[PDB]
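Hi R.,

Here's the input for the adenosine-5'-diphosphate complex you asked about:
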Amino acid sequence: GPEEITADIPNVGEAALSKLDESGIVYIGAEVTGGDILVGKVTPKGETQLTPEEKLLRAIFGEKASDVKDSSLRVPNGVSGTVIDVQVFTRDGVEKDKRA
Amino acid sequence: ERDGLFCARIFGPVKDYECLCGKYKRLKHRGVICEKCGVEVTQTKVRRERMGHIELASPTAHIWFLKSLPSRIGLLLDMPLRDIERVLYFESYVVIEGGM
Amino acid sequence: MAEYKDNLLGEANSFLEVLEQVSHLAPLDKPVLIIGERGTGKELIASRLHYLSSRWQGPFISLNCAALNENLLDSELFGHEAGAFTGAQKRHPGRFERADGGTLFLDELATAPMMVQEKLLRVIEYGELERVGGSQPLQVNVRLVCATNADLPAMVNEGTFRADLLDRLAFDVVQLPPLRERESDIMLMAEYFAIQMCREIKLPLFPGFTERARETLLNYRWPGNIRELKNVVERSVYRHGTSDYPLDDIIIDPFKRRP
Amino acid sequence: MAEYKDNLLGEANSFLEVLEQVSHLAPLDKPVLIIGERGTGKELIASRLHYLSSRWQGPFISLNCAALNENLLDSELFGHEAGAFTGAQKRHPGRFERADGGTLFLDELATAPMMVQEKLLRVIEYGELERVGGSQPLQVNVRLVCATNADLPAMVNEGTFRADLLDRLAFDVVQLPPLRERESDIMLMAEYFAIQMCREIKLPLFPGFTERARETLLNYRWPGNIRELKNVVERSVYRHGTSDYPLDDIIIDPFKRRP
Amino acid sequence: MKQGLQLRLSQQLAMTPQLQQAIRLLQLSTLELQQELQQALESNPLLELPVYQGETTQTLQDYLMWQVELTPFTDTDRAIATSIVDAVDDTGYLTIQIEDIVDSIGDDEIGLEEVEAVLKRIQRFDPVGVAAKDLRDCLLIQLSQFAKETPWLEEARLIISDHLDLLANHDFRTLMRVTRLKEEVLKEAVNLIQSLDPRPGQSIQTSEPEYVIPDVLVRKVSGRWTVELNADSIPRLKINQQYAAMGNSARNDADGQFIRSNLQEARWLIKSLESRNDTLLRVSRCIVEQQQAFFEQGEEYMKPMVLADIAQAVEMHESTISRVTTQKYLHSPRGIFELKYFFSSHVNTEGGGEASSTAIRALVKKLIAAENPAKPLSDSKLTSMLSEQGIMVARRTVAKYRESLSIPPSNQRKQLV
DNA sequence: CCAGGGCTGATCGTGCAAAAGTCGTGCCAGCCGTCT
DNA sequence: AGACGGCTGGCACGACTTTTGCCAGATCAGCCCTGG
Ligand SMILES: Nc1ncnc2c1ncn2[C@@H]1O[C@H](COP(=O)(O)OP(=O)(O)O)[C@@H](O)[C@H]1O
Ligand SMILES: Nc1ncnc2c1ncn2[C@@H]1O[C@H](COP(=O)(O)OP(=O)(O)O)[C@@H](O)[C@H]1O
Ligand SMILES: [Mg+2]
Ligand SMILES: [Mg+2]
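And here is the predicted structure with adenosine-5'-diphosphate in place:
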């Protein structure tokens, strides 16, 4: 399946996603240091197995299903600064355009 | 792939103890070989220590000899490198034996 | 196992004797034959004979020898394999093989032509049949039940029936007493059919029976034992159409003019 | 082929002669004709005659001369090849080809159609047969056994039977005697049959017959040789229903008036 | 009106074994085709700085072994820990059960209590709740880890202890009457349970690669997209001039006949491959023509089709198109799909029209997703508003679509607002 | 030396149909919500 | 607390799709042998 930038990143704290907009990219002017998240990207995994363990996990928690993995864009170690401006490019035929 | 480069049943198993087929996958099996696929259940670090061979139905010369500064085949046969080279590429038709 | 009584009315005298006789025939696995006048409720007892059997769960299928397409007779009787002849797209089960562990109803044996008699002559004694265009033979076990209308011994001397087939199906014969001779359950049959008809016409209740109606019932010859009695009761009660009084007149024949 | 026992309870001089003649004719290859009266163990003889021969291990297949269709008659007799007609899709064996090495046992030859009579003679005489749409001749060897109750010498004069077909088939015909000729053995048959029947109907043990019943079963015409004595004894014992006192009631004809 | 053997022609047909091979040549994908093509190439003789030494990565098992190396175990405890950590999945839950681990060790002295001691010792490793037997003893570890100061902790522990099914079935009312717990003050405790990172071992490494191969390409030239084949992916064979120019020169009959036969076979193979490519291209063009609306507008605007509809548009047969459209992935601006994915069953709608099954399934997906969380929409109501739209599919088909969509029933997804 | 006959190989051909499979839709059983 | 209504899923029954498994022959053209 296609990868999406939706900011629904698993195994992460609310403090990390504090600087991310609804689309998953940083606000213009935010200060970012070290290994914070810049763009929240997820890569789809295989279909959830019928196994009762995964079925129970979906029934309890939901919305994760191990469908996605955290392959987000993070600032490299020892790099700090303030975001000046972002630029997003979407190919023709794709009309996601969350905040583009 | 099966019976090729980067294959199993040669060069050792794959990343973990599991066999290629999927059965016999744990540390409980330490030296067994599966029947549906012949894959020894060992560490994957052995993948860098196991080598294979190619039959090479027709014989072939070794370029390290007969092409260094002295020629080993030349000095063994008392035969000059030019005729050695012409014979080793199917345009010279050297004589093997025949005394009558 | 259940009772499978179905519809049983007007049981008295020799009819009760016949029921008592047929009660123990079901356990046996010998062919049976029923003799009786046309429309003497012969099928009812033939059907109940299958249900009283231990293997009552066997499917029940019926054929009438008076209705056999001479073109398809062999295929219907035995069964045809796939591709045996042109136009046979799939394998089709035959009638004899259709029932296995279940009884087969035969009718109009007195009207059975020599052709059908010969074609069926062997499949009974040994229970062995091979399909038309067939490679290998099948074996089945079916209890045959037969109904007829004429004197099979008479047809045997006449020569249109084969004594071989007759004794092949002559273990025991059940003679159904005709109702015009019993004369003991005519009131009960008539009143039962009267309640059924008056109920299904959604009328409140059925009045009695006129004494003159009873007088003229016994006088009639009644060729229809229990197949025209029901019909005449239904038609006459429909003609009256009210619970006003016991119906004085029975419309014995509908063809009679209204005036 | 060494040891074969089944049924054949009758033991008389007349039966001794024919049973010994069967032993002589069994190794021989020539076809035999089994004449007799209805219900006389004709199948029992033919079966033993084939299975006592040197080709018992070969396949044994029977057919009814009347049962098979008239339209598909040739295909039934010989078989067809793939693509001969629209319906056909694979090579199909006929009876004559399936019966290679073994025997073909025709049943009730007297009822065979004119078509079968003119079809069968040429292949039966020598051994040549052409499959439907075939390209080359086929040759199979089948010992022929046939049985019927009709009178062929009279039938051929009438003309519904081919003369040469009878002539090239009637080597050393076998004739069985009617039941009335056995005399004493009928008591043994009745005792055996009653024992089996009372075993089937779950009654403990046969109580025996009476002198009256003995005389009645001795002195009667016996139009049907066998399968009629079986039926009469099995119906009489069933009507008896108990073994407190010996078997005395005899019911020769089920067709009687109501009791 | 009879049974009789009859005969009348209205059809024609013919085929040879090599033609059968050529017609089965187009049933299979290109990547699998190239193997058999290389096999025939091997038989027929006249037919025909970089980045290296990548880095080593740290997976969960390697990280756990690293942490085991720096912890003070005995030799037996170290062997047990190595076995336990070897029997650990990517998600972080151990696969085999504890008695199986004891059997794998196969020592009389080794006991369940000892293995439990070692396992609980390694449970406190950096990914919390790793190597847990099941879900019950993975959330509990983190609840116990959290400091007692935060509220609703006792409530969360009580629910997670032995009310796991009670929470799984979303049967909040029975959960309340079982726990004797507060009304709508349990919601924050349930949310605390929700924010507990299930499957903790997943986050040690999450890199997933890109594996896409296109067989057919379509590009939008300002309307009415034209379809092109994949130039790189397509196979091709070229005759060999050296061996084609020595069959006549050879004076030996054996060599001449050998070269002639191999030339014949090679040319037939080349022709068959070219025909397969042409047929695939034509089929792809026709299906994209009949599916122009869906590419523009989305899955729910798809017209239903059958193999007959696409076979009549060409001169090929239904069987031929079915053989061609197997294991073929076409690439479009919207994404990568399969040629066999377009064909779907049809359902009749109001006004005489028909709607494709996948379109109605996607519509059901979006309609179910865009619903109020307090009151779920059931299958009957789904059928009702689909009939209002005019599709009028049965409740059985609604349930089948919902099940194949992997969405649980309406009464199962009900949740507190 | 030119024309007639034989013979061998080169060339043509991607559909028909039968059976397995899939589809939609109904029937019935078992668990759950709610009022009496 | 029990009955009534409702929701969901397994199984079944036509109706329609789709998947595989078939296995050459005749006919024409050029070359060689032979008759005129
Ligand atoms: N014991 C009975 N009491 C009342 N009606 C009976 C009884 N037996 C048979 N009948 C009626 O007789 C009718 C005809 O039966 P039957 O003569 O067997 O039909 P068929 O003409 O097929 O032989 C049936 O409709 C049945 O209702
Ligand atoms: N000698 C015998 N012993 C026992 N049973 C016999 C004997 N002869 C005939 N039968 C009985 O006769 C039946 C065979 O009938 P059969 O005479 O072959 O009929 P058909 O005369 O039509 O060929 C068998 O069921 C068998 O029990
Ligand atoms: Mg009737
Ligand atoms: Mg007979």
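One thing worth noting: The radius of gyration of chain E is 32 Å.

Cheers,
M.
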